[PDB]
mmCIF file of C-alpha atoms and ligand atoms in Angstrom:
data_model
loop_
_atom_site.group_PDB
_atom_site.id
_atom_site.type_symbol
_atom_site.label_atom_id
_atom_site.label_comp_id
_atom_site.label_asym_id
_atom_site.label_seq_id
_atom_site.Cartn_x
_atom_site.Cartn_y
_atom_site.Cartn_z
ATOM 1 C CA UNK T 1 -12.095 -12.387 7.977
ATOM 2 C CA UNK T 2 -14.071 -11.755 5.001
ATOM 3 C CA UNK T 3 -16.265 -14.994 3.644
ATOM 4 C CA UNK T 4 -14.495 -15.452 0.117
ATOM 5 C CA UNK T 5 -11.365 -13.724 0.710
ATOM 6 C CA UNK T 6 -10.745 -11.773 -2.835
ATOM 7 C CA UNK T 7 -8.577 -9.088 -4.655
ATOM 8 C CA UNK T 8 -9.824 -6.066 -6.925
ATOM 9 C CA UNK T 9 -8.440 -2.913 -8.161
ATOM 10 C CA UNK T 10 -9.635 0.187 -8.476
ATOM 11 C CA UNK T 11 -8.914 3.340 -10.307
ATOM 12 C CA UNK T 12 -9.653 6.326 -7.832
ATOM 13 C CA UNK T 13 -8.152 8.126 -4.864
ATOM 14 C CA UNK T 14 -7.300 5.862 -1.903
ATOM 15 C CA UNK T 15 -8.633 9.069 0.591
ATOM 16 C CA UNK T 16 -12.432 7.775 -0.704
ATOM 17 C CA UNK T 17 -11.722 4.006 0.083
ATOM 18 C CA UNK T 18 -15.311 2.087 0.977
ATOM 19 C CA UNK T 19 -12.996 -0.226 3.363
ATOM 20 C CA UNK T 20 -11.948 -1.007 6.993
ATOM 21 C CA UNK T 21 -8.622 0.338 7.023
ATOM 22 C CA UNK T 22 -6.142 2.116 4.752
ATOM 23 C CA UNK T 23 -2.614 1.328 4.051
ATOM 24 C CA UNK T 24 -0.180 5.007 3.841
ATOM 25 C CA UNK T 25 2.607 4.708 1.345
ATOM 26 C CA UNK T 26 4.142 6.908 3.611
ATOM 27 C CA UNK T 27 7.848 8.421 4.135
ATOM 28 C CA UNK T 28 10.016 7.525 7.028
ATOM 29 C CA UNK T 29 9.828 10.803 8.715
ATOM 30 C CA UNK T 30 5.830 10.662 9.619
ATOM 31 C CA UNK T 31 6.074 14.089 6.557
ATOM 32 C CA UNK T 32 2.755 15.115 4.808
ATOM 33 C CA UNK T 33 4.894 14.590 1.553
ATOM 34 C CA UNK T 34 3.207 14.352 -1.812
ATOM 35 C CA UNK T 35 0.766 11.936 -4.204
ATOM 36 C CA UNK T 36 -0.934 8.787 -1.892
ATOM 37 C CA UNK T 37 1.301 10.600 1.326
ATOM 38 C CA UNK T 38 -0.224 13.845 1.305
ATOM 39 C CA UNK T 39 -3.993 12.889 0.320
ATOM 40 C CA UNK T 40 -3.809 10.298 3.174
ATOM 41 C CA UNK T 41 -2.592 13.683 5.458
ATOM 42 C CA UNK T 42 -5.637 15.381 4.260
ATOM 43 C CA UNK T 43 -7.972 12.687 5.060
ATOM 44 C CA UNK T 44 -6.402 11.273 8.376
ATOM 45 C CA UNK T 45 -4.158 13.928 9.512
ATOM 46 C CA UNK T 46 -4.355 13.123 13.241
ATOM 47 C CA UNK T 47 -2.849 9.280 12.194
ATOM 48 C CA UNK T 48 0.484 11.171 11.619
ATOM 49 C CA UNK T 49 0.977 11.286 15.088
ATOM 50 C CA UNK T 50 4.464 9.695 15.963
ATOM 51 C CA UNK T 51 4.392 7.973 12.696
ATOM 52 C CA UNK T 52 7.866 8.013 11.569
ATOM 53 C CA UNK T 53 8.773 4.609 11.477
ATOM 54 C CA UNK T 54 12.365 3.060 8.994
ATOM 55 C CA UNK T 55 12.607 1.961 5.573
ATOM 56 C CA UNK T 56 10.477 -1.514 5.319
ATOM 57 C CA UNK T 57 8.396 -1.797 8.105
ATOM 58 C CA UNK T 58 4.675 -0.485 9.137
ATOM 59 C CA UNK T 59 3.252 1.295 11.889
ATOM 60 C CA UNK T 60 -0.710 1.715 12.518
ATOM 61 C CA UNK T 61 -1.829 4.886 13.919
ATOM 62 C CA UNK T 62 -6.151 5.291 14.023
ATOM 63 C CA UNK T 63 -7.586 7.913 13.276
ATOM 64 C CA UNK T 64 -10.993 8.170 15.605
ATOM 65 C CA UNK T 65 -11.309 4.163 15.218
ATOM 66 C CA UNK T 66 -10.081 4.099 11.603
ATOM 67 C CA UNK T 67 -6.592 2.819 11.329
ATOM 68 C CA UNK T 68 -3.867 4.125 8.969
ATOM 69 C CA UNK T 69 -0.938 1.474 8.440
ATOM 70 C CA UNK T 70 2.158 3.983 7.319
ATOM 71 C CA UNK T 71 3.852 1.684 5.017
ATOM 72 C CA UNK T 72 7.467 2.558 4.125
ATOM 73 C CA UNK T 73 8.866 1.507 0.874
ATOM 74 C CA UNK T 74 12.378 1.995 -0.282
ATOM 75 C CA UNK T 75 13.174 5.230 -2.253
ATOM 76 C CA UNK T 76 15.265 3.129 -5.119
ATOM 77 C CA UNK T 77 17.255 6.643 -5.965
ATOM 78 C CA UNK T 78 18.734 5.814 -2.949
ATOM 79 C CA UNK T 79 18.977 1.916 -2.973
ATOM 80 C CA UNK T 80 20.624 -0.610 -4.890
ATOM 81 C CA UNK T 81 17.955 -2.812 -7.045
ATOM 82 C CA UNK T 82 18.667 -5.759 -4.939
ATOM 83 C CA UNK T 83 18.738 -3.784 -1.278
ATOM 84 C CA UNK T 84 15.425 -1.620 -2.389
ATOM 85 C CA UNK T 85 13.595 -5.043 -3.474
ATOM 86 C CA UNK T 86 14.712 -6.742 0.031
ATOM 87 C CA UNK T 87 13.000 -4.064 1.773
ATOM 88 C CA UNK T 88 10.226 -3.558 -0.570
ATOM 89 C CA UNK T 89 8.980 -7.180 -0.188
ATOM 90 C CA UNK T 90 9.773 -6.521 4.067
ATOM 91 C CA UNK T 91 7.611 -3.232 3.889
ATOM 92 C CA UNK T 92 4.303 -5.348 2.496
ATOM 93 C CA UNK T 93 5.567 -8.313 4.858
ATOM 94 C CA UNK T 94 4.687 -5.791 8.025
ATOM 95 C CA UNK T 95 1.672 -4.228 6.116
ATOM 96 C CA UNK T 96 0.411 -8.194 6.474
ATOM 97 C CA UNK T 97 1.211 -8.395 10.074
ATOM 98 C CA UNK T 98 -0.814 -5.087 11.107
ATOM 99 C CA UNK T 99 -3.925 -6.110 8.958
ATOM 100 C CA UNK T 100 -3.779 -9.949 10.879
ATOM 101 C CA UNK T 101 -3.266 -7.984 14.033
ATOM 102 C CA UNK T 102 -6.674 -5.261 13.725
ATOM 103 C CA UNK T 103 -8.646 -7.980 12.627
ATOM 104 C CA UNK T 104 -9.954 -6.248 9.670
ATOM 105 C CA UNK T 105 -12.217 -7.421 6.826
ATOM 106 C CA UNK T 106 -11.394 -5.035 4.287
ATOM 107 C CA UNK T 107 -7.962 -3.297 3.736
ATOM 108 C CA UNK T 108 -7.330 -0.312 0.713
ATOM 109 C CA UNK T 109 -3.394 -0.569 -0.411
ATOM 110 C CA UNK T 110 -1.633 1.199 -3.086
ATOM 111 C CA UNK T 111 1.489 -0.103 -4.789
ATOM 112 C CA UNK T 112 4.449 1.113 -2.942
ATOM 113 C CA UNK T 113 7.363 2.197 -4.512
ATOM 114 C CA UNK T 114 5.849 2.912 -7.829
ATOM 115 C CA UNK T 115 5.332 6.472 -7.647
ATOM 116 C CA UNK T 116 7.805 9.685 -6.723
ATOM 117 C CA UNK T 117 9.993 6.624 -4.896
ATOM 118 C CA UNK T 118 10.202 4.181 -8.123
ATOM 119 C CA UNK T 119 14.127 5.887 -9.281
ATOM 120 C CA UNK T 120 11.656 6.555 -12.295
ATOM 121 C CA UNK T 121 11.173 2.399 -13.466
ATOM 122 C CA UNK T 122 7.871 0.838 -13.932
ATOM 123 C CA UNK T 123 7.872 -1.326 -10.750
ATOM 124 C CA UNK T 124 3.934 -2.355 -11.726
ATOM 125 C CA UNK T 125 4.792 -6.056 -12.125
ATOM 126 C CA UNK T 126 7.640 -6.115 -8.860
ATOM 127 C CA UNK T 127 5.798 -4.288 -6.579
ATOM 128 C CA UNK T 128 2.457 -6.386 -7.111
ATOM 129 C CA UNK T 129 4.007 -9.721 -6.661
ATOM 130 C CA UNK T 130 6.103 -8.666 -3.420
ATOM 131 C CA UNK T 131 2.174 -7.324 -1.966
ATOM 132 C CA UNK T 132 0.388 -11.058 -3.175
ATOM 133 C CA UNK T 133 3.179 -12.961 -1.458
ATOM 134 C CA UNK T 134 2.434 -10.715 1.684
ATOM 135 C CA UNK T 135 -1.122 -10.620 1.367
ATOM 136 C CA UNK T 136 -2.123 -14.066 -0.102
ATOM 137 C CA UNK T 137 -2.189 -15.776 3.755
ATOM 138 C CA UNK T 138 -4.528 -13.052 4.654
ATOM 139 C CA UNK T 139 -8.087 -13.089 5.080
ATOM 140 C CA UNK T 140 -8.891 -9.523 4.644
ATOM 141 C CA UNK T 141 -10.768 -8.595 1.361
ATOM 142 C CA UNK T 142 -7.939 -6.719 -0.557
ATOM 143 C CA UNK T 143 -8.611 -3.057 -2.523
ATOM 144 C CA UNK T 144 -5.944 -2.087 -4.607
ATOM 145 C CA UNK T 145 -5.944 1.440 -5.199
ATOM 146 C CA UNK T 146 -4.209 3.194 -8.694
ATOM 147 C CA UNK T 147 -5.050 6.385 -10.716
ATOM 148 C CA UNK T 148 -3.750 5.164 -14.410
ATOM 149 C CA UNK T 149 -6.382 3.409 -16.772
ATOM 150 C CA UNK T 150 -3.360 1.387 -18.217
ATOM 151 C CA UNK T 151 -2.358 -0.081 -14.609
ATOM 152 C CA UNK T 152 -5.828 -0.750 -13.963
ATOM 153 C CA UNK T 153 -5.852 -2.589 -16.925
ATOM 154 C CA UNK T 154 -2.274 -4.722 -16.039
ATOM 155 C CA UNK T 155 -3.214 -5.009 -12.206
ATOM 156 C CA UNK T 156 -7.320 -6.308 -13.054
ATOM 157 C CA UNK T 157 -5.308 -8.799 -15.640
ATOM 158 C CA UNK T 158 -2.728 -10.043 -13.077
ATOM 159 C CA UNK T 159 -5.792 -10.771 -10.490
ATOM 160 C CA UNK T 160 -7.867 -12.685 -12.802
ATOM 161 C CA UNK T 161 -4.873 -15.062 -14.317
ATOM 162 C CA UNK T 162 -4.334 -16.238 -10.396
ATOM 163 C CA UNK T 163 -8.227 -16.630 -11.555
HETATM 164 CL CL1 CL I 201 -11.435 9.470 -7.236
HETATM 165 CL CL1 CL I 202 6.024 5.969 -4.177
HETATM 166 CL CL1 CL I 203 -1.120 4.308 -11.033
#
């Protein structure tokens, strides 16, 4: 584990993360797809290998010895706001299983859901809190990745208040 466990943010493309392992806010069908998806394809494309997995769960291909953890959120055009939070909060649930399991230091994770799959709401706040109830048991050094100076901004603020 790392020696003070910590979170940060950072406002940059997840594809040029500086840690152990990268978390894919991927689509159930193991698809290229678009935004975090098809920059992680780019980078990794031989973890798309049998990577289809359902709608809240994770599955860790590696790439060489780098390991991609395809994290699929719920599309909430398609769910109910109670069904698509259920399976948002199961999707980071497994994202903290496969991080325990690689014995990682270091993990890069966007905020899933928030993007093409959000049914067009601001799910900054939601999809944080479901990722530190996963993720605060963990040991790994967590990187949050975004690409908006205004998230960066709410995500750096919600950190430090936890202090
Ligand atoms: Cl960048
Ligand atoms: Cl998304
Ligand atoms: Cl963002």
């Amino acid at each position: 584990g790392a020696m003070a466990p910590s979170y940060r943010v950072k406002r940059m493309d997840i594809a040029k993360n500086d840690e152990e392992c990268v978390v894919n806010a991927a689509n159930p069908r193991g698809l290229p797809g678009d935004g975090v998806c098809k920059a992680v394809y780019k980078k990794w494309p031989e973890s798309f290998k049998n990577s289809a997995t359902p709608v809240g769960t994770a599955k860790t291909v590696m790439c060489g010895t780098y390991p991609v953890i395809h994290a699929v959120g719920p599309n909430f055009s398609n769910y109910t706001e109670s069904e698509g939070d259920r399976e948002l909060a199961a999707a980071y649930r497994e994202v903290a299983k496969e991080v325990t399991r690689l014995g990682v230091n270091s993990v890069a994770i966007p905020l899933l859901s928030t993007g093409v799959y959000s049914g067009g709401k601001d799910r900054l706040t939601q999809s944080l809190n479901h990722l530190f109830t996963a993720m605060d048991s963990t040991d790994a050094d967590v990187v949050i990745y975004c690409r908006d100076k205004e998230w960066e901004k709410k995500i750096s603020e919600a950190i430090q208040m936890r202090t």
